[PDB]
Amino acid sequence: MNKVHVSAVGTALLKNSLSADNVKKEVEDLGLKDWDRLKFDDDRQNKIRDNFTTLKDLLLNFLKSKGKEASAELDSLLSAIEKLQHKKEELYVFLYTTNTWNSKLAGEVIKNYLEEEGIKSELATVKSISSEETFHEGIEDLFDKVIYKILKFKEEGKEVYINATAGLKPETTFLTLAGLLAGADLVYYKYQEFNDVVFLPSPPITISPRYLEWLIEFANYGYTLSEKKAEELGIPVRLLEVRNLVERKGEDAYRLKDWVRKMLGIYLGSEFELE
Amino acid sequence: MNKVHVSAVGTALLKNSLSADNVKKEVEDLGLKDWDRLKFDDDRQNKIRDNFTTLKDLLLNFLKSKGKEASAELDSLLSAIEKLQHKKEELYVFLYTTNTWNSKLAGEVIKNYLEEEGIKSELATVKSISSEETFHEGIEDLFDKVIYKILKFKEEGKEVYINATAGLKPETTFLTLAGLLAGADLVYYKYQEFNDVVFLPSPPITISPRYLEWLIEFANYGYTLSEKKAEELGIPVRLLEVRNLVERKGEDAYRLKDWVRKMLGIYLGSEF
Numbered sequence A: 001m002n003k004v005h006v007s008a009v010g011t012a013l014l015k016n017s018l019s020a021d022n023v024k025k026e027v028e029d030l031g032l033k034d035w036d037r038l039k040f041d042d043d044r045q046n047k048i049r050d051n052f053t054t055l056k057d058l059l060l061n062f063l064k065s066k067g068k069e070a071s072a073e074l075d076s077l078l079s080a081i082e083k084l085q086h087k088k089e090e091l092y093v094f095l096y097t098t099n100t101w102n103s104k105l106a107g108e109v110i111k112n113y114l115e116e117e118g119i120k121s122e123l124a125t126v127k128s129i130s131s132e133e134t135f136h137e138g139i140e141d142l143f144d145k146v147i148y149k150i151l152k153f154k155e156e157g158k159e160v161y162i163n164a165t166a167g168l169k170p171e172t173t174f175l176t177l178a179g180l181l182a183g184a185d186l187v188y189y190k191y192q193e194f195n196d197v198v199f200l201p202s203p204p205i206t207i208s209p210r211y212l213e214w215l216i217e218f219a220n221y222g223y224t225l226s227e228k229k230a231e232e233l234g235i236p237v238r239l240l241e242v243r244n245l246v247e248r249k250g251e252d253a254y255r256l257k258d259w260v261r262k263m264l265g266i267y268l269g270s271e272f273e274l275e
Numbered sequence B: 001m002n003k004v005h006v007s008a009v010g011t012a013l014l015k016n017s018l019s020a021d022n023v024k025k026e027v028e029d030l031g032l033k034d035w036d037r038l039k040f041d042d043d044r045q046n047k048i049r050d051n052f053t054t055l056k057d058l059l060l061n062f063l064k065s066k067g068k069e070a071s072a073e074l075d076s077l078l079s080a081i082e083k084l085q086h087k088k089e090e091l092y093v094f095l096y097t098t099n100t101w102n103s104k105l106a107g108e109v110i111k112n113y114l115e116e117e118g119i120k121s122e123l124a125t126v127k128s129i130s131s132e133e134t135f136h137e138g139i140e141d142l143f144d145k146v147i148y149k150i151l152k153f154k155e156e157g158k159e160v161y162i163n164a165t166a167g168l169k170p171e172t173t174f175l176t177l178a179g180l181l182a183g184a185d186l187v188y189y190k191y192q193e194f195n196d197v198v199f200l201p202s203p204p205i206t207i208s209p210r211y212l213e214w215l216i217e218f219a220n221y222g223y224t225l226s227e228k229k230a231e232e233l234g235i236p237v238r239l240l241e242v243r244n245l246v247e248r249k250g251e252d253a254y255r256l257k258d259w260v261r262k263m264l265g266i267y268l269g270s271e272f
Helices: A012-019 A021-030 A044-050 A052-066 A072-084 A101-116 A132-155 A169-181 A209-220 A227-233 A237-242 A258-268 B012-019 B021-030 B045-050 B052-066 B072-084 B101-116 B132-155 B169-181 B209-218 B227-232 B237-242 B258-267
Strands: A003-008 A091-098 A120-126 A159-163 A186-190 A197-200 A205-207 A224-226 A246-248 A253-256 B003-008 B091-098 B120-126 B159-163 B186-191 B196-200 B205-207 B224-226 B253-256
Touching: A003 A072, A003 A132, A003 A169, A012 A021, A012 A052, A012 A072, A012 A101, A021 A052, A044 A052, A044 A101, A052 A101, A072 A091, A072 A101, A072 A159, A072 A186, A072 A197, A091 A101, A091 A132, A101 A120, A120 A132, A132 A159, A132 A169, A132 A258, A132 B196, A159 A169, A169 A186, A169 A205, A169 A258, A169 B169, A169 B186, A169 B196, A186 B169, A197 B132, A197 B169, A205 A209, A209 A224, A209 A253, A209 A258, A224 A227, A237 A246, A237 A253, B003 B072, B003 B132, B003 B169, B012 B021, B012 B052, B012 B101, B021 B052, B045 B052, B045 B101, B052 B101, B072 B091, B072 B101, B072 B159, B072 B186, B072 B196, B091 B101, B091 B132, B101 B120, B120 B132, B132 B159, B132 B169, B132 B258, B159 B169, B169 B186, B169 B205, B169 B258, B205 B209, B209 B258, B224 B227, B227 B253, B237 B253, B253 B258
Parallel strands: A003 A091, A003 A159, A091 A120, A159 A186, B003 B091, B003 B159, B091 B120, B159 B186
Antiparallel strands: A186 A197, A205 B205, A224 A253, A246 A253, B186 B196, B224 B253
């Protein structure tokens, strides 16, 4: 399957499904009125868990009934696949979603629909972003679970298409940029009020070689540099600091920020810190 | 003003302002009940135009009253300014929005509010994206009105912070990517959720140099090349085409897509 689509899955499907009276009955009787908006540690997530199969078949029947438009994910996926003329034999759909029952439900339902339609696909899950503290881990997890998989796909000799329709804005802005750094071929988006997908300018990009040399340099010296050592290596720490590439750690020292190291992994391999 | 913040302006302010009865009254009497969602060619846009100044004063008063929380733009702007400890003296706020009356209204209101708060700013306007056909023009326009300005700011030795909070996904993903290609320093985002700005991974990036050389090559021979010329110059037009950089217009011929032209002829020259 040499043509891979990457798509986040949200819970809009959960919400959209309440249109239908049968779904609204079943969800209301289970106590799950706001199942699209549940927090990751809300107890109602265990009611989705405990009732997974049912809610699955119910959302897949809703989906069959009223068709792909109930999920912006499917709509943009299936529209892009139509417009690019990607054959079912050639296709793979790498879904990811947060590690929460309402999201996994949406994700399993969409996975099964794609498989009923002759499209092989996979659903990875990723850490929730529930605060400023969990955001940076959230992004590292997307690196590990998605960006590094885009890398694998590109080594495998495949074409990668990013579906930017789905996902929260910051998480898809990150996926688009990291995705293209990892060699993704094309980024697409379906406007809610259009039927056709558009192709975002997806130019082939790499970290500035100037900055790539500097950033690899911290790796030689224990990911830290005094101002005097940086200046001797010609590395403008005060500009790296503006660009949130380094943090000042103490009076004289600058440490290469952890997110940069994840991203360097695109260039030096995912396990380069362990060699 | 060494520190520029870039921010789209959406109409969410127009919608949020309906939670004051005076605004909702004036909106309903004027026929403007869904003014946040009006398309670019909707006739109700002329009611905003015809009433611009008064609807300005109305939204600015609502905004003073209830403060920056009424606008994702102000909220994220003022929060990022707070978190980065940028002084008002050193700031310039580059707002852009579509050339539509409901958008310009939101944008003028945000511009005046920032100026009342001692922050200099401009409001650039850009062509509306109303279809597949107008999308590519829309993106060329963002290049001309925003990306090229990010470039100018960076030649001046100013620092550019992109506020990714407001904007539709495709307009903000393009601003982030082309913004960083133009040398923008940092991209930030404020979740409504947890009321606090985060810094998105924003490495300095460039066009792949192999491709930059190929792309500048097309720019020497008009902006079209036969298959026999391309393979002679060692250019995988096959791979340019997959990455939407060239179209096959001609017979055995390839044409450099217009947006690529307007991205070369923004960051790395200004000729042909």
